Amino acid sequence: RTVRLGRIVTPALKERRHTYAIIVGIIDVTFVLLQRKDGEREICSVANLHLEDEAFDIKGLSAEEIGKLIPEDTYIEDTTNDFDRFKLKLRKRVEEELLKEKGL
Amino acid sequence: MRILVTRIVKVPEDCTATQEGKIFTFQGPKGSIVEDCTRHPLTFDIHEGNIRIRLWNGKRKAMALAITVESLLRNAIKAVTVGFAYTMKAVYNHFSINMEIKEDGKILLVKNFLGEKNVKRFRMRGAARVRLDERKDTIVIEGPSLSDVSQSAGTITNECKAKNRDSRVFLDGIFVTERGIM
Amino acid sequence: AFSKVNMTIPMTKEYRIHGSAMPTEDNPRPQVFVGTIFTKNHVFAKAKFFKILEKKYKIKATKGLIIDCKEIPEPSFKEVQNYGIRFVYRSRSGVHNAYKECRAISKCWAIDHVLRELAGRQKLKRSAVDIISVDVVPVESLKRAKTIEFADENVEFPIFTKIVNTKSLLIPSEYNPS
Amino acid sequence: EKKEHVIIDATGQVAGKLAAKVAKLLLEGVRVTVVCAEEAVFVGSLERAMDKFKQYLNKRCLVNPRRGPFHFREPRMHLAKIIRRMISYKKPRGKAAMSRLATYEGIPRELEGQPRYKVTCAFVKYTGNPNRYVTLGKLLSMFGWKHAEAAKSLTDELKERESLASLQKKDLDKKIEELKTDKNFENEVNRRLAML
RNA sequence: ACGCUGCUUUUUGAUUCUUCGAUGUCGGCUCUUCCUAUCAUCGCGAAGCAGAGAUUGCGAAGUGUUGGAUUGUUCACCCA
RNA sequence: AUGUUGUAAAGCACUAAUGCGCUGCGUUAAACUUUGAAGAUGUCUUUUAAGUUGUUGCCAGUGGGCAUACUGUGGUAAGCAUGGUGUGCGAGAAGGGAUGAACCUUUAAGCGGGCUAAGGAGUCUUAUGCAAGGUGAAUCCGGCGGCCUGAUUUUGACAGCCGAAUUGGGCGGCGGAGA
């Protein structure tokens, strides 16, 4: 994978790796200019990025033609206070107590 | 500096290259060769049956290394297709220099050499055979490798030198006179 | 993607100043001067404006007047261009001139980037440098090869630095943290 | 009071950067064993590392060398001495911390199926000299260490029989998977679930 | 050559910080250890190096470096 | 508001020095001065600002000092000897500089709650990161996507027909000999 105009990127930590951005400018070997899904442009260094395997062409795309190519955020808020996640662990305990007498 | 630099090494008809993670293996109609490149920071691959080498953002010491690695690969290619063969000649003033072959061109003995009672003995490097040409006093060294043919000849020259006397008068030794082809 | 340290707001600022000598009744309505200064600090900019007038004319700060001081704001839209920066700097043994092109997103971001490169290559602080001018160079008046090559579109290259993708102290034995 | 235990693997780890972190674990009450102690590395050239070990050997009490400093040539004993000098070991709180450490060349037999860890900051590929280093086993073999071929053997025999144990485990994961997708299976378990 | 720049602590000066209810003050004999700025032995360069004999330089401190006449001598100077 | 001064620097008007060209060019001064600072030092006005002492009794210790920032004199020089202005140790703990009379912070151990200074944040040992370069003298040598100046070249340079850059002087950081 290469640095180029139109490459998709993601942050480096494996958590917080559910957001996206696109490259819209190259300053030197270390610094690029990004545009996030919301409209903001920012300067980041390539030691904080993780290059994805899809790229595009952006020639006349102004700011919104070029902002419809960013994928959407794949994050899910959570629930299940204490009783919701008690049942799921309850369902599995019976399997091993049965799966033991069946060997395996 | 540049953003990219590329070098190409042509692979002829008979040679058949092969690559297992930076290690290159050649096989022509004269033997095989293993040219290992695991320690260099460059990119290798075979493009249209040729060898390609690339370097991104190298300064000047990495660019000098990329051109020396390219010319060691074209030396390994023409070793297993044509081979190498060096020719040496012994010259003297008073004492005849007698030479012998012991194994199948693996050992070379050097007799009298300035009246010495000592007998010098040379062992050829791997995959190189010593022969005896017929001019009057001449040997030939041949094999499918430049590394071993040239190091076997350079040892013989370095070890016949007449210690502790004026080198402008005692001009005896064994020299290389023809770097050629098998 | 976030960087967690803001690199898009520069440390340098720009000010446009009008100044004069302090009026008297032997010299009422004196001459007015104007100029721009790149620095931090409203207060730092006024003192440098008077060191300028004091060395060409002989007007000092204790007998001078500041009439106006304006800070130019950053651009709202961001876009990479080419720049050229005239300056002089002080050495262990004298004063010298230099030119130094580069790429940036504004005039003050381009000065931050030139200072950032003189700190490793010549070991200068920031107070040893004076800026004479900053301007945008179109594409074909470029004097350096490094900017002509990056100013192209369809530029491409891989990167070879590593990446830390976790902030733990111990990782499992077969994990590849990069 | 603590009873935690950690096995640390040193294969591509800078020896000083690992020692400083292993010593902070010992002071906070954790038991550590370092295995494969001959595979830690030193950044640089072999000529630079031999010159530094040669100055170490020169230190010697002239009056009576039996009292004098002791120069260890085994990789497990030498790397244990680098961890000891990271801390104040004459005092009683430091004597206790050194009681919680063990070191080995290769991998011993008892620690065969247990998980190992690496230190995230001591990987040699984060420096600017990746591909210029010396292992602790090659440096020490040039000053007297004999058992360098018997250590590579013992580690590969354990790796191979730790890879077979992974094939038996993976196939049972597929035979148990089909049973969970059964007919008499579910109608049974739905009854045990029925009686809460 | 005429000029110019350094290092050591083996000379002899310059100084007076420590010791005057006391640190036994020259040399030899005996015995051990360290330095290299190497005299010999090992390896190797240069020449106005033909050979022989020497002269000049580099790596190198492992091992060696004596017996006598005259003087208390250190030192000096001769014999083998 | 109104008086006094002859140092630094500079200069040749006096005293004393110093090369040439036949009016100019060249070099000097603790015991030379035609000039001449920064700084010091007198007086008037609180009918200027800001702030808020006079007279006298009985008596002790002390009269070997030393350090330093800046600044002189003698000396080849000295952790040497001897002057000037301020501040310290002496008679000054505590925090920091690994260790230290004098260095930097700061002025003294009652019981609680908050915040900083000097100095620091891999580990001993309380506490985070971002970026650019990189991997003891005279006197010599190399390098850099650094900078300043010149010359040559697609009408084909430099190196030895080929097809694109070549090169002379300097400067500023960095490294190597001298060691």
Ligand SMILES: Nc1ncnc2c1ncn2[C@@H]1O[C@H](COP(=O)(O)O)[C@@H](O)[C@H]1O
């Ligand atoms: N500048 C470079 N240009 C070309 N190949 C490189 C460069 N730097 C490293 N490599 C090679 O690319 C690989 C680097 O990726 P990695 O081994 O994952 O660190 C190795 O195979 C190197 O030989």
